[PDB]
Symmetry: C3
Subunit: 171 residues, 3 copies
């Protein structure tokens, strides 16, 4: 089981900020999973071609059953993570953005400003998350319960979870 983790951010990629977002993803997936898995981690600038390049590499060459991104989903000019995700996917999963936004609105009205989306590239699920750790955990909690079954639907690795933390639904 390989899961990709992409932090998208000029400042985090500069070695300016410490990367609290990519931290929260790895730590969350660690609380979630009891099966064996391998984190493939990268921090990259707000550059669309680079986002597209690094998603293709993880999915095509490294067999990530799942890639999660953080950053680059708001209305700022340089936020292009969703455009990059749309470009490298062959089909979109509109239910992910819908739910992540609906959950985040329990917290902040500005949840409607995220353009986060999800889609499939071959047998890889790609899911965009926002920058803030608290939002990361809340987005993953909303959406993760359905991810293992998605992977099984494309005959990928059988992800098993610590059920006291996250409960995967398999019909």
């Amino acid at each position: 089981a390989k899961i990709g983790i992409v932090t998208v951010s000029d400042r985090a990629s500069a070695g300016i900020y410490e990367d609290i977002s990519g931290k929260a993803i790895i730590d969350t997936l660690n609380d979630y999973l009891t099966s064996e898995w391998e984190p493939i981690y990268q921090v990259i600038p707000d550059e669309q071609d680079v986002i597209e390049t690094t998603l293709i590499k993880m999915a095509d060459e490294q067999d990530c059953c799942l890639i999660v991104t953080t950053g680059g989903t708001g209305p700022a000019k340089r936020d292009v993570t969703p455009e990059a995700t749309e470009a490298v996917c062959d089909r979109m999963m509109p239910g992910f953005g819908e739910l992540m936004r609906a959950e985040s609105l329990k917290f902040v009205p500005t949840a409607i400003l995220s353009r986060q989306t999800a889609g499939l590239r071959g047998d890889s699920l790609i899911v965009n998350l926002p920058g803030k750790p608290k939002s990361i955990r809340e987005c993953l909690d909303a959406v993760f319960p359905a991810i293992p079954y998605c992977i099984d639907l494309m005959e990928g690795p059988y992800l098993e979870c610590n059920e006291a933390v996250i409960k995967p639904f398999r019909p």
Copy 2:
């Protein structure tokens, strides 16, 4: 006249709990006469497109409902075929169907179901499981008789005691 399309990758002879749940629900809803135009077909994007086109253009179905071919596997190509034959999409349908379906089947977020209009016909993608089909229709049908009204199609009447459609 309502079209019902089962998109499955079997192989026709089997009982089809998807199609009958659609027929049963429409039967509970409506107090006016209607004719189901039923087809089962493979998940081949051409065959789905062809079927939808025939029901809308040639057979004049006011509503066409699909079940199947809407999930994440590569072969699930129902939403693709629906966008192919429709000239305008209705984003509200999918949002509401997923948001009601996921109250019970958390994996409803994996559905790529959508809806749109081909000329005057409304096409709606539904999921495979009967209980989900019923949830999806309970959420959206209250809008459908008005929508058909605006397409100057037939005036569908409901048993107000099972479902209350809105006519502003």
Copy 3:
């Protein structure tokens, strides 16, 4: 100074006689909200996709409207092309807006799912499709306007200020 575009999309309102309650309702609502100075950039136009595009383009690009709200032309009838025009002039969509407006309208009217309104960015201008009824205009705006001043700060635009007794915008520290 904030410039806000208001576009009324109606064959019959632009023919002229035939006064525009729905654009007035939008301007009224924005005055209810704002305590900071703004200018409304207002136009009434026909249900014609090329005229809609041309208007949205001028407002965003020449008139430097930081927010543009449209009213009319988002139902299932084939002459309703405001969403098509909006999609054509925007570089990226804001799907949170359509989702929420429809979910807020569903509280009142089952038929909110027939609405095709959307929202998007053209450069640094936000464009939002509103419904036609004055009361629905107010309910859609109450739902989305709390995100809009922060959205505009993120686009390096003017700092909008609100009357908190009326509307509470979130800006994260």
